[PDB]
Amino acid sequence: STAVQDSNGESWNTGLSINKGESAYINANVRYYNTGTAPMYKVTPTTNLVLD
Amino acid sequence: LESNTAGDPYTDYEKASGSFDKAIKTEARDPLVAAYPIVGVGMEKLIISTN
Ligand SMILES: [Ca+2]
């Protein structure tokens, strides 16, 4: 018995991997302001960022 | 017989006169009360970010 097969296929695959540690990257949009009497030079504010 | 009796960086005149960093509490103007910061840190929350 002689037999001959010729299969041909096409695969698809869509993947998604995530870092539970670094799951997104934050980017703020801020506006400084001064209310007092004196001009400040080389302004450097420290910024507490609270979620809950 | 000492520049600074209390031992802190401020001399007896400085403490007595009250002519230093005025934010210092007033009792530290006594040349025997050490003008001396005592700083501890308090915990309020802890964040566990699993990687
Ligand atoms: Ca002295």
From TrEMBL, chain B:
Source domain of life is Bacteria
Tell me the organism's taxonomic lineage.
Bacteria, Bacillati, Bacillota, Clostridia, Peptostreptococcales
Q: What is this protein called?
A: ADP-ribosyltransferase binding component
User: Could you say which residues of the full protein are shown?
Assistant: 262 to 312 of 876
Give the encoding gene's name: cdtB
UniProt: Ca(2+) 2 binding residues: E2, D12
